Ligand binder design. Sequence first.
Ligand SMILES: OC[C@H]1O[C@@H](O[C@@H]2[C@H](O)[C@@H](O)[C@H](O)O[C@@H]2CO)[C@H](O)[C@@H](O)[C@H]1O
Length: 138
Amino acid sequence: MLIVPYNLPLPGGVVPRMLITILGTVKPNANRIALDFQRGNDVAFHFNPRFNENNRRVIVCNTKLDNNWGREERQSVFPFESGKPFKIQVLVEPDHFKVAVNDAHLLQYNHRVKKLNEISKLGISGDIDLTSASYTMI
Ligand SMILES: OC[C@H]1O[C@@H](O[C@@H]2[C@H](O)[C@@H](O)[C@H](O)O[C@@H]2CO)[C@H](O)[C@@H](O)[C@H]1O
């Protein structure tokens, strides 16, 4: 049980083989979830399930640099369901963040922010009950 929005420090930033695991349950009538891997004020990797964008469900991924959002990458495969427990695993690989939900590969996001060791915080927000947020090296 954790308070949302939740900040998970990532000491010394991220590095390949680092696995971040988030467990929670989507609230009924959820509108959004967001993971924000941050480098100071910049967002290296924004992972944003949207439950009702023009009556469609979509995951939007992007990067924010100097307060400007870049080119969105959109995934219509949408494994989250209102009211249900989920597990998000984010594995840092040399060229991308690799995301699996409920043990199924979902998407990859190529590193736009190159200074991995400066991506030192993960913000977790949105319409969830957050159970746990942790990391380990695999
Ligand atoms: O790109 C991720 C980013 O999207 C933002 O959406 C705003 C605006 O609300 C939309 O109407 C428009 O399509 O895009 C802009 C900027 O990209 C949203 O506000 C942020 O929270 C992020 O999800």
